[PDB]
Amino acid sequence: MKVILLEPLENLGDVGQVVDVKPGYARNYLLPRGLAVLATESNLKALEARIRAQAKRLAERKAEAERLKEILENLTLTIPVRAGETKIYGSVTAKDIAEALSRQHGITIDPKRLALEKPIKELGEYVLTYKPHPEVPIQLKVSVVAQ
Amino acid sequence: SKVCEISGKRPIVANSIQRRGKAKREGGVGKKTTGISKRRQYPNLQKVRVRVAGQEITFRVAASHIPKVYELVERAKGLRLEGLSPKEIKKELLKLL
RNA sequence: CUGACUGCGAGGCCUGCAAGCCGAGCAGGGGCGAAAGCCGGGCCUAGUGAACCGGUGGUCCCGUGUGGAAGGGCCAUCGA
RNA sequence: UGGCUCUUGGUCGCGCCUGCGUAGGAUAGGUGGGAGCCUGUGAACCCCCGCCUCCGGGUGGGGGGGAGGCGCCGGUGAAAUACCACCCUGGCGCGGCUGGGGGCCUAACCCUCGGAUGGGGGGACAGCGCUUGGCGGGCAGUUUGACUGGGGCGGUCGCC
RNA sequence: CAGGCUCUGGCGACUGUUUACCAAAAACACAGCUCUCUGCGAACUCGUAAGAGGAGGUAUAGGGAGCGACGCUUGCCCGG
RNA sequence: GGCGGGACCUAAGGUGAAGCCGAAAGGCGUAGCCGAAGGGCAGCCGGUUAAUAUUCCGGCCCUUCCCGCAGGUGCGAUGG
RNA sequence: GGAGGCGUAGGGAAACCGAGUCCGAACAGGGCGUCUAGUCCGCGGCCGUGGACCCGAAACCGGGCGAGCUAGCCCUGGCCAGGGUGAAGCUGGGGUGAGACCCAGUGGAGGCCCGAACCGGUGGGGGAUGCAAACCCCUCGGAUGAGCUGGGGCUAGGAG
RNA sequence: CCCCGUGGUUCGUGGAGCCAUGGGGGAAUCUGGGCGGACCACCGCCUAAGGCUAAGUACUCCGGGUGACCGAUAGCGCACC
RNA sequence: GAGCCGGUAGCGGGCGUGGAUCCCUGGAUGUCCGAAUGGGGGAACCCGGCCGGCGGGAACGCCGGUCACCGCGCGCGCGGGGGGAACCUGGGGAACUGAAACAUCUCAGUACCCAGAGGAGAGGAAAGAGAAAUCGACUCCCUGAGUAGCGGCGAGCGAAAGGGGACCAGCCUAAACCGUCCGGCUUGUCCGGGCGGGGUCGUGGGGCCCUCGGACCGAAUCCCCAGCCUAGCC
């Protein structure tokens, strides 16, 4: 008797998988405890539809992030600050990088996503990863300049 | 020893036919019926307790139709059944047949 | 040497029925006899069992839309 | 009517190993492919351990050495050899799927608990459905002959 | 209105019970003896079942069978 | 109104919301209900009629419910 | 109204053939056939089928009706004159180291005694189209118990 | 649909199909499925597992019509309280 | 259309050509029991709830309305209950008897019990028949035919096709797809549940997608009427 699992179950199957078990183990254990539903036609259509919708929103995320990456990499964020020699008096942070990318170019970007462990305290040309979506990293070249 | 609540399966009346001798196909003289009596063939009735809308429903259903019952529960996923007594829920499920 | 025959059987004994009994002769292929002939078991009178059901061998007659098969029929013999 | 585990049994899926005549280098599974394969995916050979021992070996290994060795050739028998397949003989270890057993689990099912979408106990047994064989005057339907100096008992029953 | 008595046997220990309407007994019952079943959702009985009785009891208890106060006893045969 | 019975109570049993079982008919079943010669409840004597009386009448008692008055108290139940 | 029925062809298990056909190798011999009927209605005799000339069982089966008689049980009430015997215990005494136990008194036990009511029905006589489809007289058994009895209830036919 | 136990049909296990189904197993959607008497091939017929449908048919409590039916022991058990 | 107050005369009183008695139809009244149904109950009796009225009426009593249970449908509506001589279908289902015993067989799916329906009931539009290169729902009568077959191949049991007749009628759903309302949470091209549209076939039909074409039938339901029945008249 084929069933659709609801949770990952040890030595039996993964969540969402269609497995084959004795009718007693399903009627008197899996289905009561809400661990699996009957593999009927209706909820099989439902599972197919949920997989379709999940892959659809995943493709939406990856395509939106690919468009956003096509936006960047063809630009250099130039941030003027006050600095003496190569050391900056203040510090350019992710919040400041975001304020710059929204004031010029006009891109509202998530500052928490920008991989930046310590505030930028020196001048020059940097490359930082943005990562809006895993496996889709974005290289941003920022020119921290003075005056 | 009663009725299936899903298929309506009822006890039937069959005959017990006692036979002796060798069959003609096996080179024998033939089967001689040495007695017929009446007897009852009941369904394989069993109890099936399912949870529906929070209430416990019991079904006295023949074994051969245990899956059918679960179909009903599936088909009951779109009914206004909250608060109703077990008997009313059972009537609803049977009306879904 | 195998007539302890196969295909028949005029005509009778007996007799409620059904049975039981004797049987010349015609043909088929035979046995013995030089031949005439004889041989269809046993000097004779007991040594037995009707049908129904089924087994075996043969036959190739019927074969449930057609061709086959299943199952039966017919000939022979078995199970009192 | 289910979960787990152990244990044996059967079959397949792989890893596989295993096969002993005269003769013949030695212990030749079979039918083929087959005239070359193999070594830093480190050689002829040296010792220690499992394994099957037809008492000769076979083979998995390890370390040293660290680059040689076996085919076709011919000996040779029915079949003759490196190397590559497929498949048998029998064995083992993982596994499929099961047939028995042993052990455990709870959730079907059963019992119970001022408390019940629960707790506790039994537990896939018991009960019950269909089927198999058996026991079965507890009960039911019937049978249990004729002749005959009455019947019974004895004797008789067809044929010469 | 109101016991005849005594001696001595058989059977049943006793008071009881029974063939309404031919048998009141020596028959049945009986306390008591033994064998046997039953661990409790007991065995067993009634019922197709549900459910009851057993028992709101628990082996010093419940079912079955036999024997039948009590005294003294109750042997041999397990092949069917 | 006072005796007996009902407008009170329960017993075996009967019925029977819930619930369980059975081809049908129906069978069980806690609660509740019904169920009396049991529990509970207030009348005794005498007279009178052709025929009735603890029933009409006479004398002397008594109960229940409704309303009102006064006094008194946390009153109040199918539950304890 | 011609659907259909009977008759006009039989023989053969049939295939099939046909005044013939069957067994058979047979043109042999025999079986059954062929040398023509029929059919419809009325009536009568007898037959098959129905209850079949009429009356009669003991019985079998299905569904109901009965425990106002009787058997047992359950619930609730009631009745048993009078007399007799005198268990345990208690009390006092005797006894003893203490006891057992002995004696007197008190006590009022029992499927104990006698015997009415009440429940029975031993023996005899009567009765025998009876007073009576089980009675009458005499006598006799039990009568505080396994006693009797009123009312209300339950169990029935292969069942109680 | 197949197997096991049966019922129905003329069919009593018979060569036993067809219709139905108590138990066990258990499909497919026209290239699908059932039947034509085990079975197999060919050739046909048909379209299951949802439901309804007058009329022609059965009966006589009742009303009426008619008897080579009865005539008070007959005729319904009752002519009648 | 002249008598009348039943069978029923009498006593004692009345009515009718101003149309009585009598007959047909509708209506009113209809105590108590009974499916009996407010509750109980030993049928025709007993005892209540609520609203309204009566008596001097609060206690007591009378009056009128109303209150059982089950099923279906959003406290309220509709339906159900029981009876009926036979006839009908379904669920159960004997035995004597026959076989000159008896068990398979017969009697027989009869008797009876139970549930249900109706003036009828059942059945009915082919997953049929069976060999006809064929028929065309079902029911009923005749025939086929005591044939085919069944059967301790005993006793016995007993079809269908076909043909002749009576009658004559065919339909609605499920599913594909489409729409809508509702709610489930696992948020959607989702699943489920109502309703609407679409659709009903065997020469297979239907849905969807293209491509061409744009009134005649007619109920079994409803309305009206002839005819008929329930008194009579010449």
Ligand SMILES: [Mg+2]
């Ligand atoms: Mg049997």
Ligand SMILES: [Mg+2]
């Ligand atoms: Mg046979």
Ligand SMILES: [Mg+2]
């Ligand atoms: Mg044979």
Ligand SMILES: [Mg+2]
């Ligand atoms: Mg037979």
Ligand SMILES: [Mg+2]
């Ligand atoms: Mg059960």
Ligand SMILES: [Mg+2]
């Ligand atoms: Mg279950």
Ligand SMILES: [Mg+2]
């Ligand atoms: Mg099944």
Ligand SMILES: [Mg+2]
């Ligand atoms: Mg199954």
Ligand SMILES: [Mg+2]
């Ligand atoms: Mg002769």
Ligand SMILES: [Mg+2]
């Ligand atoms: Mg003769």
Ligand SMILES: [Mg+2]
């Ligand atoms: Mg002879």
Ligand SMILES: [Mg+2]
């Ligand atoms: Mg010759």
Ligand SMILES: [Mg+2]
């Ligand atoms: Mg010769």
Ligand SMILES: [Mg+2]
């Ligand atoms: Mg010669």
Ligand SMILES: [Mg+2]
């Ligand atoms: Mg010669």
Ligand SMILES: [Mg+2]
């Ligand atoms: Mg010669």
